[PDB]
């Protein structure tokens, strides 16, 4: 069994630029959305000042139309007030009511520009946020691939500045062989131990099985995972771990000691037993399940029959 | 015999951006067009608001020409109503009717702009849909190459976010040797069994033979496929499977065991 963190992340950054600083050394805890490294932000500040200058430009250009609208409006009312006395035709009234509509449209046409550029301002600011890396999730820093002061560019692979892992629950990769994967029903109880502490058993429920195998040349293997609690700060990553995965909990069922059983043919299993008569007799027994010390016998021998652990002899009374 | 899913599809994304979330867990079932991961969509929303602001701009600029068209039209009819009594020659009638054609063309010239920009709006929105990955087909999530929170860039090769596979039925890769490939007529009946269950026969029709061989150093090998049903969720991917393909059964005829044969010449 291989060992790893419950969750792990390879943090990166979208933008190119020199890495001016990296505030955190490895081994320090970091809370979510904490500041990390800081890529150079001079350029983004430049486009921001540029866009703000554009908004100022429209801020004045609107101020022009604001005055022309006053001119057209006062001209219109000043025409109508004389126009109740039938001023210089309805012609000029149509020359006044329409121009005011034009100046009215102009200010809105400018407001749309202020709208699109303020909308662009978010596009300007959003690039600036990319320069300042923040942690997606809590967990002490593991490894720093990108050392401080290195130039970096991101037009291809996402750069690997650093990595993170949540060391509070150590998932295990128990690579059970393909020969036994057919069993291994979920929720079966299992335990494991590490080579370095010899005898300090850990245990828990099996969680699930990974659909995708990865071979080591010969023999396919399939993983399985637990969820062991990790206090004390022990259990380093990728530590070797011997794993005992509960195969089954059969009960109220007999098992035959290995020393006594006979195995005719290659499937048959003679087993001499003492009888109530006191005369021993063998019985063929069906056994598939087996342990290091015993073979499980669900069927083949009546309970309480004595069995000849040594020098077994069919038809031979003790 | 190697074993694999009836269909398997890797999934990518067309756009760069931090992966804010990946709601699916591995082994979960997913129906077609279900939402999966979500790359950050702030940018696409920005271009969307920008384009909508442009449509607002033309929305007013058209309103201007709408007024000028009223002016030119009222001026024209008010010229013609006098013109039945011979107003100021046909000269001003030509100075009026032509202007109305201009104001007429102007609004259409603007409507074409509203058309091209509404057409551009689909170009804006379509990028936003790329940010939200959806599953091409039903299946369970076999693997997640890309863990949550990783930065990803699609300026080059399509990233492998997560693979999918359909396990409703299992296909087998039965690699028959090149020496025997000349036989093996399609539809010949065959069966197989896994090493891990010892004795539990599966069986079915052979489907076909793959045209393109792949080799393991020495000796070429050609594949063949079945289509075994998969009840109860058994048979993990890439499980080893011993495979018996059927040659002919001529009968009513003796066959000598090879153990004691004598073969002079």
List the helices and strands and how they pair.
This is part of a larger assembly, with two copies of chain A.
Chain A lengths: L1 E4 L2 E4 L7 E4 L12 E5 L2 H42 L7 H41 E3 L27 E4 L3 E5 L2 E2 L12 E5 L7 E3 L3 E2 L11 E2 L1 E2 L2 E2 L11 E5 L9 E3 L12 E4 L7 E4 L9 E3 L22
Antiparallel strand pairs in A: 1-7, 2-6, 3-4, 4-5, 7-14, 8-12, 9-10, 9-15, 11-13, 16-19, 17-18
Helix pairs in contact in A: 1-2
Keywords (chain B): Antibiotic resistance, Cell inner membrane, Cell membrane, Coiled coil, Membrane, Transmembrane, Transmembrane helix, Transport
Family (chain B): Belongs to the membrane fusion protein (MFP) (TC 8.A.1) family.
Membrane topology (chain B): Single-pass membrane protein
Order of helices and strands of chain A: EEEEHHEEEEEEEEEEEEEEE
Major sheet summary line of chain A: 3 strands, antiparallel
- The share of residues in extended strands of chain A comes to 15-25%
First and last CA, distance of chain A: 49 Å
Query: Counting H and I runs of at least 4 residues, what is the number of helices of chain A?
Result: 2
The global form of chain A is elongated
The value of Rg of chain A in angstroms is 41 Å
Largest interface comes to:
A-B, 49 and 51 residues
Quaternary form: part of a larger assembly
Number of strands of chain A: 19
């Amino acid at each position: 069994g291989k060992l790893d963190a419950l969750r792990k992340v390879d943090v990166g950054a979208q933008v190119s630029g020199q890495l001016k600083t990296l505030s955190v050394a490895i081994g320090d805890k970091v809370k979510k959305d904490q500041l990390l490294g800081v890529i150079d932000p001079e350029q983004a500040e430049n486009q921001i000042k540029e866009v703000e200058a554009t908004l100022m430009e429209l801020r004045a250009q609107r101020q022009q139309a604001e005055a022309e609208l006053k001119l057209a409006r006062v001209t219109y009312s000043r025409q109508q007030r004389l126009a109740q006395t039938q001023a210089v035709s309805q012609q000029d009234l149509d020359n006044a009511a329409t121009e005011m509509a034009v100046k009215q449209a102009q200010i809105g046409t400018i407001d749309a520009q202020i709208k699109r550029n303020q909308a662009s301002l978010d596009t300007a600011k959003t690039n600036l946020d990319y320069t300042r890396i923040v942690a997606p999730m809590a967990g002490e820093v593991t490894q720093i691939t990108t050392l401080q002061g290195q130039t970096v560019i991101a037009a291809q692979q996402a750069p690997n500045i650093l990595t993170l892992a949540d060391m509070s629950a150590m998932l295990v990769k128990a690579q059970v062989s393909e020969a036994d994967v057919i069993h291994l029903k979920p929720g079966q109880k299992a335990w494991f131990t590490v080579l370095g502490d010899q005898l300090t058993r850990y245990e828990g429920q099996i969680k699930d099985v990974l659909p995708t195998p990865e071979k080591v040349n010969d023999a396919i293997f399939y993983y399985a995972r637990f969820e062991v609690p990790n206090p004390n700060g022990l259990l380093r990553l990728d530590m070797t771990a011997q794993v005992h995965i509960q195969l089954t909990d059969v009960k109220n069922v007999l098992t035959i000691p290995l020393s006594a059983l006979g195995d005719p043919v290659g499937d048959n299993r003679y087993k001499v037993k003492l009888l109530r008569n006191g005369e021993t007799r063998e019985r063929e027994v069906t056994i598939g399940a087996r342990n290091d010390t015993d073979v499980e016998i669900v069927k083949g021998l009546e309970a309480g029959d004595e069995v000849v652990i040594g020098e077994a002899k069919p038809g031979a009374a003790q």
